[PDB]
Structure formats: structure tokens, C-alpha cells
């Protein structure tokens, strides 16, 4: 079960990046389950509650969710286990 069911929707999550000043793409972040925390480039997954900061210019949000929070069930539901596993190699 997600830690924040209210952010289970993509539109709900993307609405939080209305004023985003970073190069990391907000649609991709929202697609990877993240919503902005409203401070810096800090984002958090609506499901696993995992938070990420200090993004890099060209970074893959899904790659980072699998990297840091491999246990997120939203992540495997969307990317599958082989994807997460490949990231851990």
C-alpha cells in the first residue's frame, strides 16, 4: 500500500512541479512515482516514501528509484524485477 495514496495519480504528482527550476525532467520524475517536496530538487515516491535530492543534469529517475529503493512495489509493478536487478549490476 502506498504511504501517500493521494499522490498515486500522475496528474496529482506532476501538479507539484508547477515551478521547477531544475534540468531533471519533471514529467519523468512524476512518471517514476515522484512528487516535489517543495524544497530544492527534493522529491519523494508516493508509494515507498523514498526521497531523493541532489539530482544531476541528465539523470534517469526510474534508474534512481531502482538504485536507491529497489524494494518499492510501485517500481516493480512498473519496471519489473529484471529491470531493478539489472540496475544492481
Amino acid at each position: 500500500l502506498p504511504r501517500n495514496p493521494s499522490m498515486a495519480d500522475y496528474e496529482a504528482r506532476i501538479f507539484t512541479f508547477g515551478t521547477w527550476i531544475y534540468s531533471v525532467n519533471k514529467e519523468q520524475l512524476a512518471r517514476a512515482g515522484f512528487y516535489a517536496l517543495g524544497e530544492g530538487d527534493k522529491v519523494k515516491c508516493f508509494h515507498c516514501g523514498g526521497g531523493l535530492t541532489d539530482w544531476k543534469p541528465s539523470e534517469d529517475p526510474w534508474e534512481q528509484h531502482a538504485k536507491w529503493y529497489p524494494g518499492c512495489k510501485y517500481l516493480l509493478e512498473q519496471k519489473g524485477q529484471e529491470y531493478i536487478n539489472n540496475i544492481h549490476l
Binding site: 500500500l1 504511504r3 493521494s6 517543495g38
Partner: protein, 157 residues
């Protein structure tokens, strides 16, 4: 046939006693936390919603004044939208925090209800089960009203 009238074993496993009291203390503790957290969450969603439709009205007005305003005015209207945006964000943040907490309280209440059920305490089971039921109903409804407001803000953007 008729049932066999009996009774002799005390049914005294220490585990049995511990389990029954545990079920009772926990069903009460979760009852308390569920009511308390559901109230706080609904209140935060209501306050967040206010911050949303306030910004929605600010936008509807600024839109209405498009052209009618001049340099300094358009700037002053915008500073107000900036401060309003920031308020809504802070209220949203607080609401998400409490939504997670309520999720835990609900989970913990369901655990207790299931335990009371397992141990045969149907009364405590049903009460908690009916309580969780109501609290879920009300929180979904307030969230839906909250979505309505969010959609209007978006439409006004």
C-alpha cells in the same frame, strides 16, 4: 441428542491470557489513534483545500484584470499569488505527512480488529471494523472535494 455438559480444564496457557489482554489494549490504543489521526488529517486537508481555492480565486481575478492592470499593479497581484502559492504548498506538505500517519493508524486498527476476530472477541472486532469503515468513508469524501478544488485551480491556470 443433546450436548454433553462438561468443564474441567481451565484453558490456561499463559500465551492465551497475554494474547487476550494484548488484543484489548491494542484495540483501544488503535481506536484512539485512528480517531485522533483521522481528525488531524481531515483538518489538514480542509485547510489545504482553503489554500487551494484561495489561489484559484486570485488567478480568476488576475485573469479578469488582464489588460486592465498596469506594470506595478500586475506585479503586486503576482506577489500575492506567489505568497498564496507558498501557503498552499506548506499546507500540502503538512497534509501529506498526516496522510501517511493515518495510513499507519488504519493499518494498526485493522490488525487489532483481525486479532480480536481471531481470538473470538466479535464485539471489539465489529466495533473497530465499523469505525475503520466510517473513517475511511469520510476521508475519501473529503479527499474527493479536495480534488474538485484542485481541478478548478488547474482550470484557472
Amino acid at each position: 441428542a443433546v450436548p454433553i455438559a462438561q468443564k474441567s480444564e481451565p484453558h490456561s496457557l499463559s500465551s492465551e491470557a497475554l494474547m487476550r489482554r494484548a488484543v484489548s489494549l491494542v484495540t483501544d490504543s488503535t481506536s484512539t489513534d485512528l480517531s485522533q489521526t483521522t481528525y488531524a488529517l481531515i483538518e489538514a486537508i480542509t485547510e489545504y483545500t482553503k489554500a487551494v481555492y484561495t489561489l484559484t480565486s486570485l488567478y480568476r481575478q488576475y485573469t479578469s484584470l488582464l489588460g486592465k492592470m498596469n506594470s506595478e499593479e500586475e506585479d503586486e497581484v503576482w506577489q500575492v499569488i506567489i505568497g498564496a502559492r507558498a501557503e498552499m504548498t506548506s499546507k500540502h506538505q503538512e497534509y501529506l505527512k498526516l496522510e501517511t500517519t493515518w495510513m499507519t493508524a488504519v493499518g494498526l486498527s485493522e490488525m487489532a480488529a483481525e486479532a480480536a476476530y481471531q481470538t473470538g472477541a466479535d464485539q471489539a472486532s465489529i466495533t473497530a471494523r465499523n469505525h475503520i469503515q466510517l473513517v475511511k468513508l469520510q476521508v475519501e469524501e473529503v479527499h474527493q472535494l479536495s480534488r474538485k478544488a484542485e481541478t478548478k485551480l488547474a482550470e484557472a491556470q
